[PDB]
Amino acid sequence: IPTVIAYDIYSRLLKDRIIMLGSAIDDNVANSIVSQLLFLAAEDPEKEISLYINSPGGSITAGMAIYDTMQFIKPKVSTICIGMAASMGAFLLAAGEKGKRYALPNSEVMIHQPLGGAQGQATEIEIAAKRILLLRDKLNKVLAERTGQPLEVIERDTDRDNFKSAEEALEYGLIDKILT
Amino acid sequence: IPTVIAYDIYSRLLKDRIIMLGSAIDDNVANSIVSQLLFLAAEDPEKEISLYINSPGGSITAGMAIYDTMQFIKPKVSTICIGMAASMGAFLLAAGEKGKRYALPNSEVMIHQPLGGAQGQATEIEIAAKRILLLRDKLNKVLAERTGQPLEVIERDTDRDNFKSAEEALEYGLIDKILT
Amino acid sequence: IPTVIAYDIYSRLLKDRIIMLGSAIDDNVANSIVSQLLFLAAEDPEKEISLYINSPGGSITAGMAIYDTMQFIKPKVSTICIGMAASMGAFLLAAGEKGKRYALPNSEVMIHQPLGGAQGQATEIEIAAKRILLLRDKLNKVLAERTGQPLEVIERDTDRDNFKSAEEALEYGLIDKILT
Amino acid sequence: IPTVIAYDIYSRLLKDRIIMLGSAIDDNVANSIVSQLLFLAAEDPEKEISLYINSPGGSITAGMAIYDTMQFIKPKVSTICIGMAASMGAFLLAAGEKGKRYALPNSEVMIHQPLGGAQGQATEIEIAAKRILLLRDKLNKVLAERTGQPLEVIERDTDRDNFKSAEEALEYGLIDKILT
Amino acid sequence: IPTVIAYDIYSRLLKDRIIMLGSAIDDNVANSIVSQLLFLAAEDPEKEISLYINSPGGSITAGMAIYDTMQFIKPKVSTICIGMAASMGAFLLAAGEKGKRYALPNSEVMIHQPLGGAQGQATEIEIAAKRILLLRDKLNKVLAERTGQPLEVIERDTDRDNFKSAEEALEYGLIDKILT
Amino acid sequence: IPTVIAYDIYSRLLKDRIIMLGSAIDDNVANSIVSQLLFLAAEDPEKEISLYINSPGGSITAGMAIYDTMQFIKPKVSTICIGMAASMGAFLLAAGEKGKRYALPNSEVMIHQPLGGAQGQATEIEIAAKRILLLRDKLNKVLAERTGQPLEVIERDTDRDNFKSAEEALEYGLIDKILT
Amino acid sequence: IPTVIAYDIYSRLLKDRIIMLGSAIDDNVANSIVSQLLFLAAEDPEKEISLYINSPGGSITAGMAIYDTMQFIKPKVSTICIGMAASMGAFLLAAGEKGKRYALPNSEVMIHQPLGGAQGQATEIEIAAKRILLLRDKLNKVLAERTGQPLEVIERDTDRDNFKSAEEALEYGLIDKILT
Amino acid sequence: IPTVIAYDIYSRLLKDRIIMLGSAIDDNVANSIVSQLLFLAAEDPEKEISLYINSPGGSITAGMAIYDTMQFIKPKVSTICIGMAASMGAFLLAAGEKGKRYALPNSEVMIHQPLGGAQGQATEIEIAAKRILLLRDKLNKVLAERTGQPLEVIERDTDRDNFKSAEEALEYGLIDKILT
Amino acid sequence: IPTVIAYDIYSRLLKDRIIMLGSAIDDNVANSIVSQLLFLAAEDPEKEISLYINSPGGSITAGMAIYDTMQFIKPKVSTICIGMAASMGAFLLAAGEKGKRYALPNSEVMIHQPLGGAQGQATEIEIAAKRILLLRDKLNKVLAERTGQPLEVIERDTDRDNFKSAEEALEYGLIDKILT
Amino acid sequence: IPTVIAYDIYSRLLKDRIIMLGSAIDDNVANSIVSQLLFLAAEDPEKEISLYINSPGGSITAGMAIYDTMQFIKPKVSTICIGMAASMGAFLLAAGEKGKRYALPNSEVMIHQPLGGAQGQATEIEIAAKRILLLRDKLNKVLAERTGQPLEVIERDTDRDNFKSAEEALEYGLIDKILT
Amino acid sequence: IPTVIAYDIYSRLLKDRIIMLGSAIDDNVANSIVSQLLFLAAEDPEKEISLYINSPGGSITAGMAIYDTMQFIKPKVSTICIGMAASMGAFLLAAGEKGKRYALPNSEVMIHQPLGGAQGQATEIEIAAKRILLLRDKLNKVLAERTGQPLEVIERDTDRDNFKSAEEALEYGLIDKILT
């Protein structure tokens, strides 16, 4: 990482309100993007923040921490997709400021149903297999009012891996423009 | 394994119709015990077979091959418990010839819930968690017909462990007589 | 393995034309069962052979070597299921002579679509993803003429995992009688 | 392990009713000694059997099978200590017939309290910690009846590690003679 | 971590009296949050501190060092749950003041009974199993007065894993209002 | 890595608008070249940028991010091949403007098919072997209009491996001028 | 591997002149099959021998030993493909006497070009890369003589992988009949 | 090991009353030598036995078993030393019958003080340190009454490794003759 | 290894004076081949012996044992080749009796320099490098009077690797016929 | 690595025009010497640059980047060999400006043949063994014009290894002055 | 490493012209001591430098760079042995200016032969063993013309390890004055 005069390269374009996201969302990335959003919203709360996404997925609980923090602060967040947004980048790309969700002309978007696991007695499997079915049908209701489709279309599109492109994610409703 | 004149020590007892079970029940111990029960029932189908149990459990599907073969054949099987019969020896000890189910004066019996696991893709955790719940309620419906208790008592006792002795398994109904 | 007088235990059984199968099917089990079927056929070719199944699955080319070698010999093969026949034991269980496919009162049968993998260039995946698609429709057409169902029921019926019972495989068509 | 003319060296002594125990006790050694004690007592059950002990301990629940079986059968067992009988050989050495319990002139005998472990929730270190306290309050009642001491002495000096010799085990009450 | 001008983002928020907690609690995290609470208390003793929680948690002795320090200093702490608050994170919620315990709208919450282990002699298991039962009945006696429930109703549902949400943890008593 | 005075020599060249690429592309180099292109475009958006390529390959989705950001920004990028450009440096070398693609006289260039893999059921192989063909048939539709060849020449030149440069990459059309 | 009274199950078929092949061809499977062919030919040299093939491949030099030996001896060999013959079973299957070479109706046949490797100086790759080019222009000069095709078709089909079937290798010329 | 006509090479030497010892003494070698000394003295108890020693020591409680059994049976044991008898072979070499001990002319002998270890808290090292000092002082007295030296000479000769010879461990007692 | 009536397949061939060599020559293969050569030469010292070679490489000193014993004994040895004879196999192939060296028409023969290594001081490298240069100026002095070429040709073409043929080794002088 | 006052010891020398090379040339060293040559050239492009070489390097594609950049830039480059220059360090030592290539009196230059490897099908070794023979014959043509020898002398000098000695490397033509 | 006011402790003793060598001379150590000698020489070339040696010695070629650079530069180097100098520590200790080689009174010096290895064919062993015999007679000549002894004394003193002292290396000629 270079040095810009003394900043570095990711902290120089935070002075212009740009947040970069380029790795899998574990519990340390979600602790840093939350802090950057809280710092930017509490020093000039009428401007606009950008967010560039290149994530190949991540965790469910550490991806629902950036989402409601994006909804909670006062500025408006516009999300741009370079590369590929897959399975939790496709949930943050379609979750900021209807009117301002962009994509570059050859990108990709993938949506599917959650993963998990359970082990133990015959009761500690029934406890843990009843949570993931309550967790699936609460993301299926957020995506239906974010994109605009019915619920019974997203209940059967997101059953296996469903890859799209930059031109047929615009017909679905995930993005709004294609940047040139 | 001493030689007895040629034999060994385990195949000399099989000439007097004694089967010996002394390890955990994986998928190729059940094969050998099923073969020995078939051979002994085929050569003289009106005598009596014994079966000594000292076993710390095993798998469920390879422990329903025994308890099927020893109800299917024509002779009568008498089960004796030395050492400890735990969680799948307690299911075969209480499953042969009501009238002949013995135990030695400081043995030990244990009964509890099934175990299992599941992994990945929340549509196929429901498949694997709906099976073990159907497998539990067919084991504690056989134990109620074998011992004599109501079903609401065995649904409550078989939880987290239940260690008994030679004098409490006689009051519960698992054995019939303490040998001296 | 006892040594019944010299023999061992499941070679005294082969003198009464009984073949046991109790492990997963690689290409060493298939060699032994093919050799035993050939030896029993070219000794007295008018007497019935039995076959007991307790297998959890296995390979797909070494399981279709036991299948078409018992339509080729002259005697009749009768298949019995102890324990569990899953995903390649369910394909050999519904391949005995019609009238002679049995099951014990608490057993299990499971059927699903085949597995596989591919690795390499963009042409060596297209080569190996057409073989596994031809090998599935080659294998859904044998089961439809063996059980008696239409093809579009077994095409959508397997598709994930399908656990069954002894009383629930009579209605489907895999079993002709439940033994008591 | 030489050949004696066909026989063995351990299978030749068994023709003169001598059982030899020379390793740690698990549920694979207890199975063999239970089988040998069952075989020798159906083959003129009046003649006495010897048992030579050189064992450095083992399992608690698999050293009770031998102890039950050598009071269940009809002949009389005589135990001789060679080398060292420690912590479960000292429990079988003091369980031969009163009158015949021997030791060689420089041997050792060690007694102490059981071992174990527990792991899990806060209510599964309560099930498995009031079992191991119920299990050592029943070995002291057997040792107090076998040797002759009061209970509050044996529960007082078997607390850390108690090493003895051939001349202090005779005053304590574990053996009856010293062979020369 | 960026370099907001010279310090990073976690140290830029600390001069606005904001503490973040985003990992499991060993005794290195508990040694740092205690130091930050002491430094913020002995700089301006009458001014509120915030504390954001996203944590799977778990160490009982190093999780009751932050609790006692939260009640020891003079200013008032206000805890906000953001993504997930498991075992010893839901116990650090319901310790902000009385009217200042918030939660975001998604925000899962979990409570259950302690874990542990023990190994050794039969006397060193009783010592370590008599302690964890004294620890459990002092944790769910603090939880009954920070919440408002009776003791018999929170020693009954914290027996296995008990997941809540942001709308039915408010009916229980762990939350005062949810944020929009 | 020296300390030209404070700087170092990747950040002393960056203020002369020179970007260096010297390793494989692995979704973390592609996040650090996008930021440098954005910073240099927002600094002064008319002067041209250079880019030196020495890479042996990389991934496909993190190679279509640099290729997109090269076209999106307002300045003009000029690409120079320095030692070796293989399979994703040969795709980035033919993306400088149209008359500003250079190579030194001892260089190599390689072009071939994509690579990948697939594992699972017979349906999750057909899903994943159908996007790699759609991904192969859109890279040689960009290369065929970047170099100038017809499509059915690029479809058969890139079948195995194609080592050529410095006097055959100029005739093919990938570069414009050899530097001396 | 059972016992037939003293014999084996593979050594009982050998006195009816049947050789089985069920493994990959390494350097000491070829030794056993060469020894069996020599022993059967030097005992009664006017009598047919069979050979059952189910093998995934092997090495080039230890697969030409069997091919030379089964044509040096005086009897006539008749090869039968039972489950799968891939890349060195397809070369041994089309080497029995013309009129023989049967196959069962659920079989497969695969043919492709040989594999290898080289490592070292620049003049020790040139030695080992013009030997593997003389091997594959002498294998498909034998295959084009056994099956009866032009050489420019055999050197064009065997380029990636072929994967024929039982009714598709009969038109090519590899087999002669399809058994019942 | 060869075959002598059916016998072995050690069973023939046991047939004319020769016992061989050529490895380190654990409690499997002691069991076999105790069994051979028991068998050889019960079939003809007036003929002497030989014993050849080539061992580099071993355990200290499994080396007293052979000593006691040598003193206990009725025949007379004569010990010969080939190679090296070190630190427990030197204790069994000086335990044959006084008058019949031998050594070949290159037959190094070694004697030293015992080994051991201890681990635990401060009152479990005191037990294991009193035991080994009780164990050393009872081997010194046996060596003093076998060889014929004072006790305070062997208390200071056996402090480090001693390494005598064939003509040098005859002045010291301990061999009684040198063979051819 | 099938049983032939008792024998196996390799010891039935030795009754007709056939020795089979099919693995690399370590120091256990040379012992066995020297032993059965000595055994066959003493039953009847006129009848000739065969030897089939399929071996890649070996050791230099353990391959001179077989070469010496082949000329020490009185009958005449005839060497046949199938497959290989890579490094030390081709040195034993050209060591049978000079009218009786055969080869099958799909065979290969290699010849090259010996190999070795050295490590230590500057004197223990000179000692070990002065010996491997006396080995290879005595191997190709035996090969020159065995094949018939001059010495300065065999010093010249056995420098890197020389794979030939069945038809190209006949012109050189290594074999005498080609069997059909 | 000390601190000359801020600098370190390698960047204080780059205040003058001195570049050090002291490790094997991988793809990271060649990326950091190219940057230093570019920076020193585009700062005062008319003086001189020194370069000290002590390296047993090789990464042939990543060792011609430095060779091309040494002639692309303007000023001049004078190379000094300090401790040893093996292959691709001798190729860089003999590429300084003619008249200014120095060596200290103990230096030991070495030159030889390239290395490589190849794995795969029979037509992917022919691609990779045809590249390395084209890569060797273009380095021979560069040494033949840098040093001054004919081509057929360097074609057989660089065949195994030849270590020169900084005084017979001056007669060859690699250097042209020995420094004192 | 402490800090001296900024510096550290090793760069504060370089303003006073001291070089500290305290580890094994691999590469990356010769490359640093060469740089420090060049920097100290090219800023004031009339003041002498010190060099403290405490090292077990390392590579031969990376210990000749320091030796050549010590005589190339203009100032005078004065070497002081402090704890031990052994085998390219002694070779640099006896290379300072004559009259200025000191040693502390508890030091020791060691001299012996070089070491190496060789692994390839029978020609690549002769190439690598003709070099280490020639690298030894050029070190013996330097030690002979440096200490003052004849050559045939150092050719047999340095044949095995030859330890010395401070009062014993002064008679030999390695040092000039014990410092005290």
Curated annotation (Swiss-Prot), chains A, B, C, D, E, F, G, H, I, J, K:
Q: Which CDD domains match?
A: S14_ClpP_2
Enzyme active site? S87 (nucleophile), H112
A Pfam family annotated for this UniProt entry: CLP_protease
- An example Gene Ontology molecular-function term: ATPase binding
Q: What induces it?
A: By heat shock, salt stress, ethanol stress, oxidative stress, glucose limitation and oxygen limitation.
| UniProt-listed Enzyme Commission number(s) | 3.4.21.92
Q: What is the effect of changing Y52A?
A: Has peptidase but not protease activity, partially activated by ADEP antibiotics
Please name the top-level EC class of this enzyme. hydrolase
Q: Which GO terms describe its biological process?
A: protein quality control for misfolded or incompletely synthesized proteins
Q: What is the effect of changing S35C?
A: Has peptidase but not protease activity, activated by ADEP antibiotics
Q: What happens when the gene is disrupted?
A: No degradation of trans-translationally tagged-peptides. Triple rqcH clpP ssrA mutants cannot be generated (ssrA, or tmRNA, encodes the SsrA tag added to nascent proteins in stalled ribosomes by trans-translation, targeting the nascent protein for degradation).
Keywords of the record, alphabetical order, are: Cytoplasm, Hydrolase, Protease, Serine protease, Stress response
Listed under GO cellular component are: cytoplasm; endopeptidase Clp complex
Record note on quaternary structure:
Fourteen ClpP subunits assemble into 2 heptameric rings which stack back to back to give a disk-like structure with a central cavity, resembling the structure of eukaryotic proteasomes. Forms large heterooligomeric complexes consisting of an ATPase component (ClpX, ClpC or ClpE) and a proteolytic component (ClpP).
For domains, the record's comment is: Peptide exit pores open in the compressed state; in this conformation the active site residues move apart and the protease cannot be active.
Question: What is the protein name given in its UniProt record?
Answer: ATP-dependent Clp protease proteolytic subunit
This chain's source organism reads Bacillus subtilis (strain 168)
